[PDB]
Each structure stands twice: as structure tokens, then as C-alpha cells.
Amino acid sequence: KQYIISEELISEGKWVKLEKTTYMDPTGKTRTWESVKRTTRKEQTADGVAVIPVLQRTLHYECIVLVKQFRPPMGGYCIEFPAGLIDDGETPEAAALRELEEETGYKGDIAECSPAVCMDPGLSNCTIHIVTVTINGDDAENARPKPKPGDGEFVEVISLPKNDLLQRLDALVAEEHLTVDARVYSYALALKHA
């Protein structure tokens, strides 16, 4: 029933634009929306990837490897899955493995890769692939992992046990000012509810 009629640029930055979207509603009535998009999406099946990195080590409980960074839109520190935008021509799997190494130091192994999923579909067209990766923490490659940040990347690594993830996130939030990402919280909640 519903479809897009037109998309009018309102303002274009280097990285993000705002558009006036005209669409058809299911009553047959024309309506508008204010929509955000990135300027950086070319032929990628999505803007970015987020990595669900399952650190596995003999005689350890499995950990979920998370990162903490300052996020200027938020004005504060956020705890997230490692993540970044997909380079032109790069596959979602390649991007996930690369970002994971860049941000954490760890060299992972692909487990699964989602379809393109929406970040905040009432606001933006932004999409990611959510890529599950296992990290063999018994491999010597992963023994003393060093982040390789890019220019202006400043990332702290936080590994938490999968079997207590929600409580451990709650304990970090109780301890300083900082926001947990909604995807991370959602995953931690499902681990409780299962």
C-alpha cells in the first residue's frame, strides 16, 4: 500500500543529510516525514557492521567483547558492540573482522552474518549487518591483543561474561556516567530471558 513519492534535500553535511520525504499513506493520502541519511553509502548492502564477538578460551566462561568510546552525538561515553562503516567494495564479513581487529586487537572467525537490519527506522535509513564472530582466545594471535585505532579513534575494550552480561552492564552503569547501546542491552536481556 505505502510507498515513497519524493525525497527533497533539506541540508547536506560531509557525513549526514536531512531530507523531506513525501509518501503515500494507506488511506491514499499524501504525507511527509523528516528523514536522516548518511552521505557515505555507495553500493554497500548496508552502511555498517556491528560485531557480536564471542571470546572462547579453555577453562573460561565465554565472554562478549564490548567497546567503550566517546560518542560526540551523545556527549558522553557509550558501551557498544565493536562496529564501523563498510568500506566501498568491502564485504560485511571482511568489515566485521577488520573492525574487530582494529578496535579490540582480536582476530576472529566468522560464525554468522545477518541481513541488513535498521538502526532507527523512524528517523533514519541507516542499516547494519550484525556479524557474529568467535574469537579463539587460546590462539597465540589473541594472547596480548593490541587495538589498532585509526586517526581519532580511541577505544577501550571491555570483556564481560556471557552468563552474567546484563548484571555486569548494570554494574558498569551504576559506577560511572555512560550509556549502554540498545543492541547490546537487547542481547543481554535475551540472554536473561532464555
Ligand X SMILES: COC(=O)Nc1sc(C)nc1-c1ccccc1
From the list 46-54, 72-80, 156-164, 182-190, the region that binds Cl ion by CB under 5 A is: 46-54
Whose Cβ is closer to Cl ion: residue 29's or residue 193's? 193
**Given candidates 6, 30, 32, 167, which one binds ligand X under the rule CB under 6 A?**
32
**Rounded to an integer, what distance in angstroms lies between the CA atom of residue 169 and that of residue 179?**
10
**Rounded to an integer, what distance in angstroms lies between the CA atom of residue 183 and that of residue 49?**
12
Beta bridge partners of 113: 131
**With binding defined as CB under 5 A, does residue 102 bind Mg ion?**
yes
DSSP codes of every residue in 131-146: EEEEEETTSGGGSS--
**Given candidates 33, 141, 189, 190, which one binds ligand X under the rule CB under 6 A?**
33
CB of residue 108 to ligand X, shortest distance in Å? 21
41 binding partner (options ligand X, Mg ion, its own copies, none; Cβ < 5 to 8 Å by kind): none
CB of residue 152 to ligand X, shortest distance in Å? 7
Q: Is the dihedral of CA 176, 177, 181, 185 positive or negative?
A: positive
Beta carbons within 10 angstroms of residue 69's beta carbon = 18
Mask 58-77, x = binds its own copies (CB under 8 A)? ------------xxxxxx-x
CA distance to 63, 91, 141, per residue, from 53 (Å): 8, 18, 16
| Residues at the site binding Mg ion, with contacts judged by CB under 5 A | 83-84, 99, 102-103
